[model samples]
Target: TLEKFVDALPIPDTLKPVQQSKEKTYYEVTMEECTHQLHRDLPPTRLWGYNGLFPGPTIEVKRNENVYVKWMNNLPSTHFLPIDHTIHEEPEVKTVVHLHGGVTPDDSDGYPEAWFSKDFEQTGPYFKREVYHYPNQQRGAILWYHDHAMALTRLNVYAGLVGAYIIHDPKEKRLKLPSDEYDVPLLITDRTINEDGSLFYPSAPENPSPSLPNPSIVPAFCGETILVNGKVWPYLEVEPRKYRFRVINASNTRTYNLSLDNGGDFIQIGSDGGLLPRSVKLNSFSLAPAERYDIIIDFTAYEGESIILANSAGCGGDVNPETDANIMQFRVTKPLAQKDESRKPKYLASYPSVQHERIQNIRTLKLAGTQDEYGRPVLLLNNKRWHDPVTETPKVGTTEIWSIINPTRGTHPIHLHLVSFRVLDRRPFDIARYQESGELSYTGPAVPPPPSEKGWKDTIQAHAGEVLRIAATFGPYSGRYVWHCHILEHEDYDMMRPMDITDP
Candidate 1:
């Protein structure tokens, strides 16, 4: 086992644009094969990185700013991670960058089929252009970018193609939260590292059969080790002052139920979409893959104390104290260099008022799955494959209520691209009865979302045997996008579908 807190947490450098002006800012990032040390004792592990840096660079943009990124691929012709032949044929390595939570146009949305190989030698049918445009029209929030190639998302992301994207609104700066060095981004990822320092991804499903295809896709993956900002179980030293942490869960399958070991509360100010309507105090919170939470932790009272950020959630099974239970350590040993001026204001921002009367439509979708010939699970969205004709077409500038029914046995973090939405409610349903007779039966009354979810969200956790309702207004731009389970394993094995916002 790797030692915990032996290394300091790595804060990814801010990406500098190649060109900038009042009109727009431009950046060029190249995907390349690189190697970096994950732990103090482990050798450097081979990974696919953006600009040759694992977890890429933290990109900061101003709200309403027009930013363009030319994501170039310069990796080897072949992928180092295991590839399942049954999923798709070989090109071996194709890449496309999807900015999660980006309210981008269709061409820049990084459609799964719009991938390109090394040096643009080959391109997918939906491939449109070399550069992606981001208008940054949405609220200031913590977003992330990662590979979204067809049938290769899980492998590619695990191989290290993820980074943080922050949209800063100058107007919100008046709230006087932590700024500059006090503000930090903590990106958490889980990994299984080999003794030889190579990534250990399963080539086939567990308890495989002879008839099973080679490199079969597993239903889920839970790494034995946890990493924060590329370091294994690292620690961070903070002064005895208020600090803001933009916490992002970049894990492929693990969902962390995180709390401070000393039982401190997390002052939550933002969610996936951006700042909540009001800040909330929480003893613990659940963080699923692709989810982000902006919080403040005041260390002024605990000077010289070492506090642990602990995890209570399990992956595949219960959390083991020796392994996944401990996330990272926070050492409040630094002396105060300046007065603590940052304010943890209770009122931060306002969300768009909920206008249920303006809703134009309501759609019911299900999280269902079937087994493949090899007995492996094949998850789907309303029994449709990824290539099926798009049926989730909503008119632009219209509000819709989506009722997502989950009959599956596990919680799936469902994500919708191009828009952030408000959670209406969730209620338990009779799963077996509904499956047997195709009838809807609610076992309990609808419960309103907790304070953390009442704000805007791009991704949500739909627990088993429950129906989740959300309201969203498709607007500003009409384009094709996607909705999928944020769990990369399920997403790669057909749990994603096309969503089109039309002008009609």
Candidate 2:
């Protein structure tokens, strides 16, 4: 049925910039609400997107380059999806862009309060200039940008404000990996498509604004249909050689434990930041929302066979990925084409380690949640709401060791803005023991950061009953930032905190 409906997956093209220079570049993109034919069998769905296209456009940039982008809002005055008008104060059809893993300045960090509405009619408190600046000073990595409007991030992104931003460097260029066609990006996401072909969002919540808030902020949304790069159950044709796959989990709440159906292993090379210390082999891996994993697949020995990248793990937050298990199909059709030049590098990049002694600060954050008076789930960070005063403040150019304790049932993909960190270790504890008496007891050995996660990371997963310790050196520049669960719905209702980085 998918074959008769949707076309094969085509590698995304590099979005061209309007102006270019050795040190800087500029581009203009607009947000438009449009009707899109998702697949041949599926009816056209009305959604808001960048440049009026789903998954927006791929942005390619070089390391150390200064890039400027003007994200214009051409969306409708009213939101199509549900809205809870009682979220604190004002609520409008607004949007702002946050570069998921970029080390951006505070002003251009896509501050949630910096959003603007249709024709720039209304703006948020942090609204600065129209043209955003990005100092691509980080290593070569896969970055993405999406809506981060206060209290509306989940719906805004679900409406389709998402796209890839890739940063290339001289080191990666010299390493010579798969290029152009051979190099691919697959955004793995799921959506509930209605019988009428429109996207399905809940109209009522288990908890009723302020409680569930205005829009039905469901605890989690695991769609029935899985999509890759905006295509439904798409297939990609591959040659008998090697390919680099940059896989990103853009889902709002679902988690995918990715593995190959042919029982092949993934040559893991990268993470949310960039190339790891080296390559590591993985039988399978798990990705919470907003997590990225870059790996290589060898197809030389599997010609004429169809292999599926499957999702094996049942997610947390009461969402099941079993019904929508298989991600996408990759058919090894063509024979050995060109000589396979890409080889897994033993040493990908040098990583910076934060010494325990230099750690200027240490903060222990606990992820807490409970049912509201009406039995609706409500999430929290350190037992505080989103309007709480800034607490996790760090000095500029200083390092801190953060101990993130997750005793809750949900395994949150935690993200910190404006800084990247190296995971020190993770240890599981007795949840019952800790819950009974605000104390900790280790139930297992200290699990070191996985090889694939040894690199710098902006997002880290905190499994239930586990404690994740990471060291971060705040730098480049700073002001007020945010750290929160990557699960969009969990983040919107609560489960997010403000991080203030001050000058020493």
Candidate 3:
């Protein structure tokens, strides 16, 4: 029997380095197969993970520091999940690591094609080096690492090749927020399992048959089970004081509009890139996949209350609250362990300004969803495939404003690879005009970004019927990178486009 347990939030073990020096730190993680007890009452299930742990280990590094990680692959010879060979054209099981939001050099960016197989016998054409070099130059923020294999990203990440990489700032230490065990990092993901304790991944579309073309592509995947910290509908036991929670959504496609059950609101202090300029109190917010929220919830209001973290956004097809409702449990059983000294400050970190006059150039991009010749759903970026020629290259260290026109009904979380960006604004556009005459015009009132979006960020929510204008600085590095919808399925189906940064 599968039984959900509301226990203390598990802290992922920090990776200890074998060699540490003032100049650089080195660590190694092995990819292997293991059986994990994801639920208290269920039998242990087999899964693939880094260093034998699901969600890998929480990696924390300081700013302006350099580190190297030799990710070793030691898994079985075969993969158990379904593979869409047509996506990347690699039919065999292979793997590659990409720090999802890291601003490293092009070599360490984990180019999708830089994959390698077991024993490193075979490697991708762009395979550069196995040891990744990370030059943490910017302010502190919450970043993550995951599989970046060109075609097998969905399968590899589904096989449990995902983890959080946290960057710390020395200046943030002065803020004196909840530190130690009180400051918790939580990851939320959704999955469905078979009776035998294996991952349930369908190879084809809904009601798939042999007669369809591109039969292996799936538009989106919304699992039936909600998981927090790797446990099925788990619970976290906390003291009756205030605690800081860095919540991140790691689902393949599901978006979560999270709220507390007892009408207790949480404070949003930071976003994907880092701390907001000021704290914003919000009752509930929609967290798209790959977005992170640094939030603080006060349990001191009700000592014995068990607050349920619930999700109201059902599926992208329709925003009904009936599907995927409850996420996890928050049980406040203990008294004030210590006088909660942490307080939400009126002001926080500073970010770069994106004044309209500073934008050197502005361009338009499009997100569209259409059906292929075989009737399978296909997504596009400017009506181009993955191999489309580089069209977004910009001069290094130059700033460009891009208005991402998302005409699809579903909301997409757009993510850029190299530099963090600022969301200028999102306004409604006349999609009918663009569709009819292939032109553009504003149709609705312009809306400023929310308080949470005011901070530096690498991912922005691109809602349908809106043109999301974002300003990005292609500085610090000049190389190749890609940007696309953070939705894994859509991205895997070629919704991504490449951009190059050249010398000015």
Candidate 4:
């Protein structure tokens, strides 16, 4: 459906940018309705958007700088996505922006409960963003801002309220990995369209009743078409020197095992939050939703070569099929006019070593799940869900060790709000012996931590039957924040929990 729509409809141009000053980068994002001529015979259909575009605009900022965004809603009060009112619901047409993988105060953290109705007449108690101030104090990395309204996030984002947020720091400037011309931010997401070229989001199949929880399962959440930087399977022309690519998996749920078509390796220099101590070369890498990979690819070695950047097959799980095997392409041109190797990966800025004594306390949280009373899936952290209020609270200005144990069958990309962590280790556990005989057995010897995970990270992948450990510190901003599986469906279906940091 998406492929046919792409062929029939002319490629929509990139959304225009609204200007603001350096002191205050005021962005105007209006949620309005627009018509798209998906079919020649049929009348133009209406769709929601920011400035008439679905996925808004890309927002760039400097580390430690402040950003103020004003989101205005000019569309009627109506929702395009299915909402499970029983589990989660706010208003008819609501929107709130959350800077995913960012460390900011709770007021600006886009709380799900902080959603507001159209025109700000009916608003939630936590509604606080006519104009949002973002204190970009964290390290340089790739971040994203998207609609985080409860129950309808999948629809709101799919309808196009998502954009990229890039943070640059002076420490990274010394490295000179790649300047404006060489650096590129690729926001990869998938989408399914109807026969008329309009976006298609199927209704609840299992539970058709509007009152019951909408048991709507998105088709593996992997779209038939691939979009890069808001373009459908777009091609990027690049110079042959070293280029820094901040790759983000903005998909609803699809995981990409990205690799080069020519069997080239990726020199990954950083993760979601910031640059690593050293660059690690890998043949390929897997990126989950809301996850970012900062990589430096030296295209200088392949001048005049067109390297097709593709996603490897057989990497994703059973939810998606092997047929969904395409990501994006990169066409490298001849040698660049200026080729300077002054800034090398080895000479990048160094990350501060996490002091052991700085860790205030050690806490263990198990990510476990089983069939609920209705036989539906239920995930828990420390055996508790999100609405249970705050169970774990840490004192301000303290670091803690969190041991995340996942005994389920699937892998989860764990994400914490308002803070970052360094992965300590990941090891597998014995399920059969522990389940049947109730005896704990080590599946294998402890594996050394990966070099890429040495720096601060907001998201980390924990495979099945593994226990992952992370060392994180709670900031002074004391309020409620959430940690959950980055998988949108899973998160919506009760796979999230809230945490609070208070001065005890």
On lDDT, the leading prediction is 1
Q: Write one digit per residue (lDDT tens) for candidate 2, span 1-504.
A: 234214577556677899898878999999999988666687899989889888888898889888999999998888988775544344468889999888888878888888898777888988988999998998899998899998899899888788888898877876777777788988877887887789987766544555444455577887777788887777888998889988888888888888888999888889998988788999999988888988889887898989888887665343244447767888899665678887766677776552444879999999997776545677999988888888888999898999999998768899999887888899999999888998999999999987877888888889899999998899868798899999998898788888899986
Model 3: how far residue 178 lies from native, Å: 0.8
lDDT of 1 by residue, 1-504 (tens): 798999999999999999999999999999999999999999899999999998899999999999999999999998888889786543789899999999899889999989999988899889999999999998999999999999999998999999999999999998999988999999999999999999999988777888788878888999999999999999999998899999999999999999999888999999999999899999999999999999999888898899999999989999999889999999999878799999999988765563444889999999998888878889999999999999999999998999999988999999999999999999999988999998889998999999999799999999999999999898788988899999999999899999999986
CA error at residue 225 for candidate 1, angstroms: 0.5
Listed in order, each prediction's TM-score against the native is 0.99, 0.94, 0.95, 0.87
Q: Write the per-residue lDDT of candidate 3 for residues 1-504, one digit (tens) a residue.
A: 244454455678888887989999998988888888777665677888988888899888999889998887788877888776555544386788888778788878888878888767778887888898988887688888888878778878878888888889989978877776778888888887877677887777778666665438688998877777788888888888778887888888889999998988898888888898888998999999889998888787778888888888887444333336778778898766678888767578775562443567898899976776566778889898888788888888788999899888788899998888888888998888888887878897778788889888888889888899988888799998888888989888888888788886
Model 2 lDDT, residue 490, Cα: 87
Per-candidate Cα lDDT values, in order, are 0.92, 0.83, 0.82, 0.70
Q: What is the lDDT for 462 in model 1?
A: 97
Off by over 4 Å in 1: 354-357
Ranking by lDDT: 1, 2, 3, 4
Give the per-residue lDDT digits (tens) of candidate 4, residues 63-165: 8776776776676777665654544544587777789977777878878767767777776777765777687888888888887776667777777777777
Deviation (Å) of 445 in candidate 3 = 1.9
Any runs in candidate 4 off by more than 4 Å, and if so which? 1-24, 34-47, 205-220, 313-323, 334-342, 354-356, 370-374, 433-440
Clashes of each: 0, 5, 1, 2
